[PDB]
């Protein structure tokens, strides 16, 4: 697992044959295991194409990490849905962990369909990030937020209040599955594609 | 010397740590006395100076296949630990080589007279 | 769509300062934190400076010679540089436009409005 050293105005690998004092670890606060928005790479908002990110399989037990901080999250998710019997879908989260810090969109799902797989697990392996743990799973309430992990070697109540869009599903874990925001107890809006939170927000012009 | 992700990087880390320095203030520091949890976040933004922000991405994309492989190893539950452990590992590359000047190691200084 | 907004063109007396308008055509703005470049007389264009859009933080090209007075207003979507020293060799179209790293995003500045002196 590869770190990279900040030198030089660049980022350098830590695996090469001498380790040179031209930077020096004086301390092990200058280690970082900082997460990333897995949107800062341009990777799509729509709240279907996080469903198609989601992988929705059966799988080996899910594993947490202990991580750095990180960049603000434009949008990230929360999860409600069950199985069509009722049965629980996707562990609750469990003990310590908590949804992103600074996420200015979080999304919210509930409503019920066959919700594929027990620990989804991310398509792209990206890390689920829950405050300081990122996760290799999908827990139940707590919001989501896409991102990896980078490891690196150093040399206001709108911050965590901002948040818009809830929604119901029609059936899960599935891409065929429908998202309806829901307003003064309306379900409609089935966010398919290219609508901003903001762009979802205005629809209230209608209330 | 590495490069940059080739996703279209985000320009600005807005960010938040759990770091802040000093306690002003020794109710800051008593749990009684305690910040709302969200309180003790701090932030401010990043900007991409000398093209760090995009090859951070790139860092952590492609360290993430070693660090989920790895995870997957790994008989913890929530792997607390991992940067302690490559300082462990520093120092174990920092030593052991026969190291008295000639060397490549122990950062030598120049022989005095 | 990312458009910016400024007042037509303007002359001035020599050893004028000019508070340069920029104003947003949407929320975008806000992680923006906006770049400001010259083209004195149609020239290649001079990186100015910039400033954060959520902080209002800022940093200037020092060659670009008294900087220039650098404010936002995030709750007007709009954000300012003053001119300084002004005179007729100075002038120049002044962009607000966005310079962004990468494509992931940008901002641009069309309205056309140049300064100048006599």
């Known amino acids: 697992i590869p770190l990279g050293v900040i030198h030089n105005s660049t980022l350098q690998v830590s695996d090469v044959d001498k380790l040179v004092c031209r930077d020096k670890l004086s301390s092990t606060n200058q280690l970082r295991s900082v997460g990333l928005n897995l949107e800062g790479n341009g990777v799509a908002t729509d709240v279907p194409s996080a469903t198609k990110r989601w992988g929705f399989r059966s799988g080996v037990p899910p594993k947490v990490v202990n991580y750095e901080a990180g960049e603000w999250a434009e949008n990230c998710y929360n999860l409600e849905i069950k199985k069509p019997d009722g049965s629980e879908c996707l562990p609750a989260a469990p003990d310590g962990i908590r949804g992103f810090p600074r996420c200015r969109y979080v999304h919210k799902v509930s409503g019920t369909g066959p919700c594929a797989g027990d620990f989804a697990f991310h398509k792209e392996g990206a890390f689920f990030l829950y405050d300081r743990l990122a996760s290799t799973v999908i827990y139940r309430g707590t919001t989501f937020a896409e991102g990896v992990v980078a490891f690196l070697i150093l040399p206001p109540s709108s911050g965590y209040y901002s948040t818009t869009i809830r929604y119901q599903a029609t059936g899960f874990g599935t891409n065929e599955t429908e998202y309806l925001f829901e307003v003064d107890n309306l379900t409609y809006v089935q966010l398919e594609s290219r609508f901003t939170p903001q762009f979802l927000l205005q629809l209230n012009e209608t209330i | 010397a590495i490069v940059n992700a080739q996703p279209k990087c985000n320009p600005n880390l807005h960010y938040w740590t759990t770091q802040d320095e000093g306690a002003a203030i020794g109710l800051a520091w008593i749990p009684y006395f305690g910040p709302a949890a969200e309180g003790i976040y701090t932030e401010g933004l990043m900007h991409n100076q000398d093209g760090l922000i995009c090859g951070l991405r790139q860092l952590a994309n492609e360290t993430t296949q070693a660090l989920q492989l790895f995870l997957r190893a790994t008989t913890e539950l929530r792997t607390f630990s991992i940067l302690n452990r490559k300082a462990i590992d520093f120092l174990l590359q920092r030593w052991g080589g026969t190291c008295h000047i000639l060397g490549p190691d122990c950062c030598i200084e120049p022989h005095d007279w | 769509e990312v458009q910016l907004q400024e007042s037509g063109p303007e002359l001035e007396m020599p050893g004028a300062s000019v508070k340069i308008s920029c104003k947003a055509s949407?929320?975008?703005?806000?992680?923006?934190?906006m770049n400001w470049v010259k083209q004195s007389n149609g020239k290649s264009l001079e990186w100015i400076g910039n400033?954060?859009?959520?902080?209002?933080?800022?940093t200037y090209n020092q060659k670009f010679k008294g900087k220039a007075t650098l404010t936002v207003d995030k709750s007007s979507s709009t954000a300012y540089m003053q001119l300084k020293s002004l005179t007729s060799e100075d002038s120049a179209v002044y962009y607000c436009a966005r310079s962004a790293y990468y494509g992931s995003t940008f901002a641009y500045w069309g309205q056309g409005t140049l300064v100048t002196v006599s």
């Open positions: 400033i954060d859009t959520y902080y209002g933080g800022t």
């Open positions: 949407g929320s975008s703005f806000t992680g923006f934190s």
